[PDB]
Amino acid sequence: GRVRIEKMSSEVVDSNPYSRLMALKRMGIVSDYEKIRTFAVAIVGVGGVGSVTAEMLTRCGIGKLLLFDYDKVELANMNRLFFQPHQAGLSKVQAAEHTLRNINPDVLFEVHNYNITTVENFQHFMDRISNGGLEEGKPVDLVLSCVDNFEARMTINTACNELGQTWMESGVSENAVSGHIQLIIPGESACFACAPPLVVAANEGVCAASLPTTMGVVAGILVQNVLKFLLNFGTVSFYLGYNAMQDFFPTMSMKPNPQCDDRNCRKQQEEYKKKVAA
Amino acid sequence: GRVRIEKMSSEVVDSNPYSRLMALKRMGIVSDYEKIRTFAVAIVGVGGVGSVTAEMLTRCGIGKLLLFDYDKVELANMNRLFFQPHQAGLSKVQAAEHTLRNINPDVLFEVHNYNITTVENFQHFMDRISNGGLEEGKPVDLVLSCVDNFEARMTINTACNELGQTWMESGVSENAVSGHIQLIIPGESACFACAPPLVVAANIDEKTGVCAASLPTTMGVVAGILVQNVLKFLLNFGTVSFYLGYNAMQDFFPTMSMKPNPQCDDRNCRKQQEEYKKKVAAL
Ligand SMILES: Nc1ncnc2c1ncn2[C@@H]1O[C@H](COP(=O)(O)OP(=O)(O)OP(=O)(O)O)[C@@H](O)[C@H]1O
Ligand SMILES: Nc1ncnc2c1ncn2[C@@H]1O[C@H](COP(=O)(O)OP(=O)(O)OP(=O)(O)O)[C@@H](O)[C@H]1O
Ligand SMILES: [Mg+2]
Ligand SMILES: [Mg+2]
Ligand SMILES: [Mg+2]
Numbered sequence: 001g002r003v004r005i006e007k008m009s010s011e012v013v014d015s016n017p018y019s020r021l022m023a024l025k026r027m028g029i030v031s032d033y034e035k036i037r038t039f040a041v042a043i044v045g046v047g048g049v050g051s052v053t054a055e056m057l058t059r060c061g062i063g064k065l066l067l068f069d070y071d072k073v074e075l076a077n078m079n080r081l082f083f084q085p086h087q088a089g090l091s092k093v094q095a096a097e098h099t100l101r102n103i104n105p106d107v108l109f110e111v112h113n114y115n116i117t118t119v120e121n122f123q124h125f126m127d128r129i130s131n132g133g134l135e136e137g138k139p140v141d142l143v144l145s146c147v148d149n150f151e152a153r154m155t156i157n158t159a160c161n162e163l164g165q166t167w168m169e170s171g172v173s174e175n176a177v178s179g180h181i182q183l184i185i186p187g188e189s190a191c192f193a194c195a196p197p198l199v200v201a202a203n204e205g206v207c208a209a210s211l212p213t214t215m216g217v218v219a220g221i222l223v224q225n226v227l228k229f230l231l232n233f234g235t236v237s238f239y240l241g242y243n244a245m246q247d248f249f250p251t252m253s254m255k256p257n258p259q260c261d262d263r264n265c266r267k268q269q270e271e272y273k274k275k276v277a278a
Numbered sequence: 279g280r281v282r283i284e285k286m287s288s289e290v291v292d293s294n295p296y297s298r299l300m301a302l303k304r305m306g307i308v309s310d311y312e313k314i315r316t317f318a319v320a321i322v323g324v325g326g327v328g329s330v331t332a333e334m335l336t337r338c339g340i341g342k343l344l345l346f347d348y349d350k351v352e353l354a355n356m357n358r359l360f361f362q363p364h365q366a367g368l369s370k371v372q373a374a375e376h377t378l379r380n381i382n383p384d385v386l387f388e389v390h391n392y393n394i395t396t397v398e399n400f401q402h403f404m405d406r407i408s409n410g411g412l413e414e415g416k417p418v419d420l421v422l423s424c425v426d427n428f429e430a431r432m433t434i435n436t437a438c439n440e441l442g443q444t445w446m447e448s449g450v451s452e453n454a455v456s457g458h459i460q461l462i463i464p465g466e467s468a469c470f471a472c473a474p475p476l477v478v479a480a481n482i483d484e485k486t487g488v489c490a491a492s493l494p495t496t497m498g499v500v501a502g503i504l505v506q507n508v509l510k511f512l513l514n515f516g517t518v519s520f521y522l523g524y525n526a527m528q529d530f531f532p533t534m535s536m537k538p539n540p541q542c543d544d545r546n547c548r549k550q551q552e553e554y555k556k557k558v559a560a561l
């Protein structure tokens with residue numbers, strides 16, 4: 001059982017759930033780790049990738065998580081990590097909040113059980129990106145797309161281009177054996193509308209295959225990128241793919257398209273070029 | 279809750295916890311997915327890597343897991359995945375088994391709360407490797423070393439060279455930002471004594487009462503690639519890696535094949551290499 005902790009401790013005791021994290025400080029890998037408590041991350045899609053991403057961030061001591069998903073836990077989800085069979089029937093965001101709160105009571109939660117692509121929900125979603133930060137009225141520090149479809153990815157895209165919100169997009173192949181993460185700083189890097197998707201492998205009544213392995217690798221690299229981005233250590237990837245068949249992890253950097261369909265991406269690029277010549 | 283399933287099914291329904299796995303079949307990734315049920319895997323060390331590894335195999339529908347670990351869950355483990363704070367004070371193997379049985383009732387478990395390295399425990403451990411298969415008296419299909427120290431790793435090595443037991447060794451650095459997996463087929467690939475770990479990891483290891491750091495992310499990645507390798511090995515799809523490293527600071531994932539050292543410290547590794555060379559000479 002774990003009580004609420006006010007300030008993160010370096011103390012090497014069996015009772016300190018943060019001892020092996022704060023250890024990164026004494027070892028000079030991450031010199032200001034406690035900063036993790038000052039950030040808020042939103043996650044859209046608390047499925048295969050989303051849930052493990054949420055677990056990882058929670059165990060790390062993120063200040064605040066915002067979870068968006070419209071689906072309930074089902075037994076068909078039990079091939080993937082996090083959700084357990086007793087949670088079948090609950091909404092994903094609710095199951096997630098319940099477990100994660102149990103795992104780390106220091107983390108703030110805000111959950112929303114809706115589809116983000118409908119008109120009314122979208123206005124709300126944007127409001128929560130802009131105001132749902134650690135301090136209310138300030139924006140979230142990062143948005144994480146862990147949804148499984150074009151429409152939703154495009155929606156996050158539209159929102160983030162308008163707000164000028166840095167986000168990361170993650171995906172997993174329908175054949176389960178490839179995935180990727182991608183960093184989107186609107187104006188500075190290619191937004192999701194800027195180009196066709198980057199693939200890392202070749203090539204109506206049924207479903208996509210999924211493996212707990214691939215989802216764990218993708219969530220892993222995704223959150224690793226988050227930590228590196230927020231805590232300013234190592235090198236952030238703008239794109240990191242994973243091909244499970246070959247054991248291959250291609251990197252890339254996607255530059256903005258100046259005739260991008262999204263007028264706001266165009267505007268953000270403009271703003272970036274202006275800021276660049278100082 | 280989840281009901282026992284006698285025969286895995288492709289049927290795409292919300293109540294089928296195997297539907298998305300058996301999808302691999304009709305998508306020509308894995309032609310014989312159900313065969314997963316026929317394998318036994320032993321996991322030594324049920325910590326950061328082990329626990330997630332165990333979970334991954336459990337959800338996949340592994341036939342049987344043998345869990346070996348001498349430690350209790352502590353709040354200090356709560357930085358890594360799987361174990362929850364209410365499990366603090368339980369033995370790792372006990373906590374794991376309980377949770378895993380909940381996650382998939384179809385999987386058989388044999389748990390062992392002891393130190394693999396002591397003289398009497400070692401004998402037992404070898405007995406279980408040889409006989410703890412899905413059918414009693416038959417060996418396990420794979421041993422997975424998810425321990426955190428040289429002594430244990432070397433013990434498994436000794437065991438597996440003598441038994442001719444294929445195993446995978448996994449490790450994460452004390453500084454949390456690198457790790458690797460290695461496939462050891464005694465006589466065909468390098469055993470754990472064949473090459474120095476400092477040398478093996480020279481291109482991935484970042485160099486710094488300290489205690490080891492650990493990250494949920496890095497353990498998640500290592501366990502991920504480890505189990506992905508197990509699945510590719512047993513189910514016969516994709517390319518099995520004999521070594522796959524991970525540097526988290528620079529997103530570098532080196533692979534290499536490693537051939538056995540003919541002057542290996544392990545007399546059994548050497549004997550196995552002979553055995554192998556003979557079998558290739560009479561193929
Ligand atoms: N418009 C949307 N708003 C909110 N969440 C979404 C939206 N679209 C997709 N998601 C969520 O993203 C999650 C990630 O999908 P994942 O494929 O891991 O789960 P799933 O869809 O139930 O699995 P399967 O596709 O095997 O049934 C899902 O939980 C899904 O509900
Ligand atoms: N000889 C051994 N026999 C069985 N299990 C072992 C042996 N040596 C190590 N292990 C187990 O391998 C596991 C993997 O270690 P991990 O570092 O993930 O957890 P931990 O050692 O409790 O954590 P920390 O090092 O942060 O205190 C541990 O649970 C440990 O007890
Ligand atoms: Mg669903
Ligand atoms: Mg889906
Ligand atoms: Mg311990």
Ligand SMILES: [Mg+2]
Pocket residue numbers: 325426490
């Ligand atoms: Mg340890």
Ligand SMILES: [Zn+2]
Pocket residue numbers: 190191192193194256257260261262265266
């Ligand atoms: Zn664009």
Ligand SMILES: [Zn+2]
Pocket residue numbers: 468469470471472538539542543544547548
């Ligand atoms: Zn050897």
